[PDB]
Amino acid sequence: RFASVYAWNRTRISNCVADYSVLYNFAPFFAFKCYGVSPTKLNDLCFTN
């Protein structure tokens, strides 16, 4: 039930160890372009949120 664009769905992420490598099997991933942060070494970054 992905929300429409006009009312997008915002999801809070809290204290967790997030491995950005087990999500590759979750979606087709037509495009995975990324900005200033690169997903290559992302698994080595600590986020405020």
């Binding site: 979606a27 087709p28 991933f29 037509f30």
Partner: protein, 49 residues
């Protein structure tokens, strides 16, 4: 571990046969070359070699 492929899979999961060509154009005895016709050699005259 198994890398099975199914035609029912969507984009981003279909097999992607890839060939990558590695070159070493570092100034060194060159062999593999393109289809440029060799001309006669001229000395003591300004040319575009």
């Amino acid at each position: 571990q198994s890398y099975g492929f199914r035609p029912t899979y969507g984009v981003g999961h279909q097999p992607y046969r890839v060939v990558v060509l590695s070159f070493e154009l570092l100034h060194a005895p060159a062999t593999v070359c393109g289809p440029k016709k060799s001309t006669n050699l001229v000395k003591n005259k300004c040319v575009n070699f």
